Enzyme design. Structure first.
Site, mmCIF file in Angstrom:
data_model
loop_
_atom_site.group_PDB
_atom_site.id
_atom_site.type_symbol
_atom_site.label_atom_id
_atom_site.label_comp_id
_atom_site.label_asym_id
_atom_site.label_seq_id
_atom_site.Cartn_x
_atom_site.Cartn_y
_atom_site.Cartn_z
ATOM 1 N N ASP A 33 41.098 49.615 38.896
ATOM 2 C CA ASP A 33 40.709 50.098 37.543
ATOM 3 C C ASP A 33 39.729 49.131 36.867
ATOM 4 O OD1 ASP A 33 42.328 47.967 36.576
ATOM 5 O OD2 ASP A 33 43.488 49.207 35.254
ATOM 6 N N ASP B 283 44.099 40.496 37.703
ATOM 7 C CA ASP B 283 45.395 39.778 37.568
ATOM 8 C C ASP B 283 45.114 38.288 37.753
ATOM 9 O OD1 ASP B 283 46.564 42.284 37.220
ATOM 10 O OD2 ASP B 283 47.827 42.216 39.047
ATOM 11 N N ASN C 114 42.008 44.588 40.239
ATOM 12 C CA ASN C 114 42.649 45.933 40.312
ATOM 13 C C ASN C 114 41.561 46.987 40.502
ATOM 14 O OD1 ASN C 114 44.740 44.624 37.755
ATOM 15 N ND2 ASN C 114 45.146 44.727 39.969
ATOM 16 N N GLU D 9 53.663 37.396 43.866
ATOM 17 C CA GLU D 9 52.458 37.664 43.042
ATOM 18 C C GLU D 9 51.330 36.734 43.492
ATOM 19 O OE1 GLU D 9 51.842 40.151 41.283
ATOM 20 O OE2 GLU D 9 53.797 40.952 40.670
ATOM 21 N N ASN E 64 47.736 40.652 33.906
ATOM 22 C CA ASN E 64 46.662 41.672 34.000
ATOM 23 C C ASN E 64 45.805 41.599 32.727
ATOM 24 O OD1 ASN E 64 45.039 43.878 34.451
ATOM 25 N ND2 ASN E 64 46.687 45.315 34.965
ATOM 26 N N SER F 213 40.315 45.989 35.861
ATOM 27 C CA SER F 213 41.071 44.836 35.312
ATOM 28 C C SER F 213 41.238 43.795 36.431
ATOM 29 C CB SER F 213 42.396 45.270 34.746
ATOM 30 O OG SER F 213 43.255 45.756 35.763
#
Ligand code: NA
Length: 129
Positions: free
Chosen positions: A48, A52, A46, A35, A59, A50
């Site tokens: 979309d 992380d 992301n 990660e 998220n 969002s």
């Protein structure tokens, strides 16, 4: 902060992540590796809109508030910035809620694709724990 492998294993244990919801410390170290590469300051946008945040790439869509994720929840009741701390408490607290959410560590797509079913104990091999 960029953790060492055994240093992160120790900090996750100190914060009761080892065998949390049945996931051995190796599963959590492996997840953090892929990660964030053990970097507490890792952020990734992301598609979309969002973001992380942190060692476990939590998220903004569901878990933390960053003020720029329209329609999103803050189910860990924290600012996403608090997940970028050199102290991993906030990230560990929030990951405990995520892994309880019903799909276990499949919530971390890097865990499903790169750790799940692998020899995860290799990640804590030689660590004084
Ligand atoms: Na949010």
């Amino acid at each position: 902060k960029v953790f060492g492998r055994c240093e992160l294993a120790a900090a996750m244990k100190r914060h009761g992540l080892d065998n949390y919801r049945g996931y051995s410390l190796g599963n959590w170290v492996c997840a953090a590796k892929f990660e964030s590469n053990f970097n507490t300051q890792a952020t990734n946008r992301n598609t979309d809109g969002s973001t992380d945040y942190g060692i476990l790439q939590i998220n903004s869509r569901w878990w933390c508030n960053d003020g720029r994720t329209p329609g999103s929840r803050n189910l860990c009741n924290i600012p996403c910035s608090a997940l970028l701390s050199s102290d991993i408490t906030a990230s560990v607290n929030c990951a405990k809620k995520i892994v309880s959410d019903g799909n276990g560590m499949n919530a971390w797509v890097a865990w499903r694709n790169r750790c799940k079913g692998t020899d995860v104990q290799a990640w804590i091999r030689g660590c004084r724990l």
